[PDB]
Ligand SMILES: C[C@H](CCC(=O)O)[C@H]1CC[C@H]2[C@@H]3[C@H](O)C[C@@H]4C[C@H](O)CC[C@]4(C)[C@H]3C[C@H](O)[C@]12C
Ligand SMILES: C[C@H](CCC(=O)O)[C@H]1CC[C@H]2[C@@H]3[C@H](O)C[C@@H]4C[C@H](O)CC[C@]4(C)[C@H]3C[C@H](O)[C@]12C
Ligand SMILES: C[C@H](CCC(=O)O)[C@H]1CC[C@H]2[C@@H]3[C@H](O)C[C@@H]4C[C@H](O)CC[C@]4(C)[C@H]3C[C@H](O)[C@]12C
Ligand SMILES: C[C@H](CCC(=O)O)[C@H]1CC[C@H]2[C@@H]3[C@H](O)C[C@@H]4C[C@H](O)CC[C@]4(C)[C@H]3C[C@H](O)[C@]12C
Ligand SMILES: C[C@H](CCC(=O)O)[C@H]1CC[C@H]2[C@@H]3[C@H](O)C[C@@H]4C[C@H](O)CC[C@]4(C)[C@H]3C[C@H](O)[C@]12C
Ligand SMILES: C[C@H](CCC(=O)O)[C@H]1CC[C@H]2[C@@H]3[C@H](O)C[C@@H]4C[C@H](O)CC[C@]4(C)[C@H]3C[C@H](O)[C@]12C
Ligand code: FES
Ligand code: FES
């Protein structure tokens with residue numbers, strides 16, 4: 001029987017193969033929400049072309065592409081199986097992938113969900129911690145889709161816009177941290193320093209009121225409480241690019257700083273994403289752990305395994321959707337408050353799109 | 360009978376009268392753990408002399424001085440009464456006030472504690488969230504004291520260096536927030552926006568690895584969870600001074616930003632301090648709530664009552680000391696990890712001072 005409930009899994013996405021790099025960058029540079037560039041329609045295609053080689057090279061170093069779709073698909077399948085058993089009344093559940101900058105695009109997904117004639121659609125962001133640059137961007141895409149297509153939705157919409165402290169998400173993180181701690185030499189386990197690492201944000205974004213830093217911090221505290229503060233930690237930020245100021249400490253400088261100060265046993269913990277991608281396989285594993293860590297003289301540096309295919313994570317996803325359905329919530333209370341210094345007109349339209357949904 | 364256990368309540372402190380402002384500023388501009396200035400011993404006296412008038416005016420605007428000692432004293436008395444009944448084994452308990460920049464100074468308190476022949480001394484920071492600029496500075500002063508007095512402690516030392524999520528602290532904040540929400544016109548209660556406000560930190564400090572932001576963020580989440588996300592919120596930062604970059608968003612700009620965007624019912628919540636002081640009585644209440652507020656036409660802006668004399672907060676203090684004593688902890692696990700980019704030699708000696716304590 002036809003699907004009744006569609007769960008739209010939102011993520012930025014990553015190029016699956018080296019050939020997809022260029023268009024990935026192009027869609028990025030054309031996103032007005034994310035960037036404001038002079039003669040953007042001409043620069044974007046250009047900057048995309050110029051940066052493609054370097055980014056293709058990064059992906060080549062990790063196998064030739066991003067595994068995000070594979071992991072998202074696996075998580076989505078496991079989620080659905082559980083949902084059908086957890087919430088029979090919401091008939092067959094079907095997951096859809098809505099990537100922001102690669103296929104399948106958010107728009108392509110919405111089109112399919114509508115074609116499937118679903119009764120309800122749930123915008124389920126895959127970023128546990130809300131950032132206007134990530135989840136916000138994905139939600140704006142949904143609102144903009146219908147606004148641009150000049151048609152109203154044929155399905156009842158709602159969103160799970162954030163879930164920084166979901167108990168099962170926390171357990172997965174804690175479990176992966178513990179098993180990785182077991183991989184360190186036993187004589188240095190207690191000496192191990194935990195560096196939670198999350199993608200950074202330009203200070204200009206943080207200073208406008210972005211909810212991200214605070215939520216990421218919340219996730220870290222929850223994980224450490226569950227670990228009973230077994231090891232000391234610090235929350236640091238990676239992926240900064242450009243000359244502008246970003247939220248620090250930077251993960252690379254922190255790794256180097258710690259080593260130079262005698263803390264040569266480090267456990268990196270990606271805390272703001274649920275699957276492997278360029279951030280973990282290239283930035284953390286290659287440039288920081290193999291090169292930087294090497295030249296600084298670390299003794300042991302490891303990275304907790306990304307959630308990926310952990311069955312407990314699929315359970316978390318299903319639990320979130322199930323609880324969302326039972327509560328009848330259209331969105332979090334947090335989504336009803338835009339950044340104090342928000343200057344993007346769509347943000348308010350997007351929140352209204354969700355808070356105003358029928359039912 | 361003579362005191363057996365001494366609880367040193369550490370806080371920066373504030374001038375009790377307008378006449379105390381100058382020496383307050385002088386001691387502050389001379390603190391290395393707080394700042395590094397050229398010919399500091401020469402600049403400090405001068406800068407203090409310069410800023411005194413303006414700072415005296417601020418205190419005059421709130422009644423003529425800081426109420427920190429009054430509240431600290433009251434909380435300390437309540438704490439002791441409870442401790443004598445909670446931990447009979449640790450005989451009579453006595454609290455001592457160790458202000459960093461005003462009398463009684465941390466050094467004077469240590470002198471009196473030694474003098475009283477205590478068997479045990481507990482460095483109890485009154486800042487729930489650890490910053491090397493607050494609690495760290497206070498702990499360094501304890502280490503420096505003995506190192507400068509050329510004598511080893513005659514009593515056992517240990518520290519409660521942080522307590523950002525203590526359940527009773529969280530309950531106090533939630534309680535004060537709820538009762539303040541009751542003071543808003545009923546028709547606007549659910550429209551109320553909560554702005555948690557904490558003293559900011561220069562980005563140079565945040566970027567070195569300061570634990571503060573993440574911990575304050577943890578306090579915010581716990582409070583909101585206890586409030587069941589009844590209202591939307593944002594964590595913002597106040598008290599920025601100077602031309603350098605500080606962690607934002609700024610509380611003042613956020614209040615103004617919210618008002619300009621139609622959110623004219625705001626509840627300010629000081630989340631990083633436990634009693635009234637210049638930050639609440641002057642900054643938030645006068646310049647932000649009285650001036651700025653009407654500048655943009657707010658409908659209702661209120662500030663949750665500081666914890667001050669709340670009996671439940673006294674219980675929180677007592678339970679923290681009780682748990683600390685029973686656990687036999689010398690310090691948090693977190694204190695065993697200095698900032699990844701720490702460049703202050705004393706930090707490590709201070710932590711060792713505590714981790715190496717006999718018992
Ligand atoms: C001025 C603008 C910054 C606007 C902002 O604060 O967002 C910046 C952002 C992207 C920049 C462009 C991109 O870095 C791509 C090009 C890089 C070349 O080295 C100079 C021209 C070049 C075409 C840049 C011109 C200018 O510095 C841009 C357009
Ligand atoms: C800074 C911004 C997040 C905050 C915001 O919205 O301004 C983030 C979101 C997507 C990021 C981009 C994407 O991850 C794609 C590229 C990845 C490369 O490793 C760096 C450049 C690269 C082009 C990134 C620049 C910057 O880190 C971006 C643009
Ligand atoms: C890394 C990439 C290309 C630089 C190059 O090779 O010339 C540049 C081009 C556009 C830049 C972005 C835009 O200037 C918009 C943002 C400006 C903010 O000050 C920093 C983040 C910000 C989101 C920039 C991140 C990064 O510097 C980008 C994404
Ligand atoms: C910036 C610093 C905290 C981080 C750091 O250690 O560098 C904080 C801690 C104590 C603060 C100072 C004290 O609160 C005393 C003064 C209070 C006045 O309202 C502003 C200047 C004033 C002189 C403050 C300047 C600055 O905000 C200080 C110096
Ligand atoms: C150069 C030094 C910055 C130290 C550093 O963080 O690297 C800064 C910090 C304190 C500054 C001083 C203080 O702000 C006090 C004075 C303020 C006057 O407006 C200029 C001279 C003045 C005497 C300043 C000179 C210089 O800008 C100082 C000395
Ligand atoms: C606001 C005050 C100026 C006093 C005056 O001359 O009027 C200045 C003088 C010394 C300054 C401090 C010192 O330069 C030391 C720190 C330098 C960091 O980059 C910012 C915080 C930092 C802690 C500064 C805060 C603020 O800019 C201070 C406290
Ligand atoms: S930029 Fe955050 S709500 Fe608009
Ligand atoms: S400045 Fe943080 S431990 Fe030294």
Ligand SMILES: [Cl-]
Nearest residue numbers: 014066277278
């Ligand atoms: Cl990727």
Ligand SMILES: [Cl-]
Nearest residue numbers: 332333334588
């Ligand atoms: Cl919420």
Ligand SMILES: [Cl-]
Nearest residue numbers: 336337338622
């Ligand atoms: Cl809003």
Ligand SMILES: [Cl-]
Nearest residue numbers: 373425636637
């Ligand atoms: Cl004060």
Ligand SMILES: [Cl-]
Nearest residue numbers: 229691692693
């Ligand atoms: Cl700890």
Ligand SMILES: [Cl-]
Nearest residue numbers: 263695696697
């Ligand atoms: Cl250390």
